[PDB]
């Protein structure tokens, strides 16, 4: 016989052991699945699909644009994938099942107003400051991009990955005070000049997709509070 000295972790069931086990009922030829189209190779094929966000108005995927001028962001939400505008996005509901992420969140908009609605919108991205930026003269200095409304009707602002670490946390557990990776903020630059007999308050429909370099790491136990 071969003299073996078994280790200290003998007879330990480990749930994530990278190995097989004894087959019980083998030699089973399964019916073929060559007919099925669209196999998911990898779940980052699905974070890249833009899904609808939700906004505290009663949760609405679009931002209403009120016609009254005021110098503050029209919608403003932090770039943190535990924020409750990301709970029902495939960017957020896949990444909340993980522990880290790396890459660029891609915020796609869609102006669902009338075709005759001309206007301009100053998207932004502040990095985490001590104070959330509010003035249009304060999102001018951050990472902004002006979006004109015209023939096309979508703009994909790519939130950059500016971080002091190669993998940011995917959940604002403790602390990030309201400031983890900063804030997206859609300012309106010029008021939407509607012709007569057109609806006031058009609606900017927001999406949230992942970048072509958005990558996830470290699975964790999920939140089973969807079933309650």
């Amino acid at each position: 016989p071969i003299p073996t000295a078994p280790r200290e972790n003998s007879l330990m069931f480990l749930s994530t052991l990278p190995d097989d086990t004894v087959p019980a009922y083998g030699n089973v030829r399964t019916p073929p699945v060559n007919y099925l189209p669209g196999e998911i190779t990898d779940l980052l094929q699905l974070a890249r699909i833009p899904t609808l966000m939700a906004f505290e108005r009663t949760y609405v995927p679009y931002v209403a644009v009120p016609t009254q001028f005021d110098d503050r962001p029209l919608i403003s939400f932090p770039i943190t994938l535990s924020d409750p505008v990301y709970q029902n996005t495939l960017v957020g509901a896949i990444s909340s099942n993980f522990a880290n992420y790396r890459g660029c969140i891609q915020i796609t908009l869609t102006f669902c107003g009338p075709m005759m609605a001309r206007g301009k919108f100053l998207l932004s991205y502040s990095p985490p400051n001590g104070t959330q930026p509010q003035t249009l003269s304060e999102a001018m200095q951050c990472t902004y991009s002006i979006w004109d409304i015209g023939l096309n009707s979508s703009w994909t602002f790519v939130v950059p990955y500016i971080s002091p670490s190669d993998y940011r946390e995917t959940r604002a557990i403790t602390n990030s005070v309201y400031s983890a990776d900063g804030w997206f903020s859609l300012h309106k630059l010029t008021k939407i000049t509607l012709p007569p007999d057109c609806p006031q308050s058009p609606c900017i429909l927001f999406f949230a997709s992942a970048g072509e370099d958005y990558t996830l790491r470290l699975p964790v136990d999920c939140n089973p509070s969807y079933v309650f």
């Binding site: 990278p18 190995d19 399964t30 073929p32 699945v33 060559n34 998911i40 094929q45």
Partner: protein, 35 residues
């Protein structure tokens, strides 16, 4: 290969360990094509 680190040695065969499909006769391609 999955979550399998035992790179060297498979004791049981393929058709006993896994369950291969019977015959009849990375690169992340998109799940929807605009044509």
């Amino acid at each position: 290969r999955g979550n399998n680190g035992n790179m060297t040695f498979n004791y049981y065969a393929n058709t006993y360990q896994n369950s291969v499909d019977f015959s009849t006769s990375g690169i992340l391609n998109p799940l929807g094509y605009l044509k």
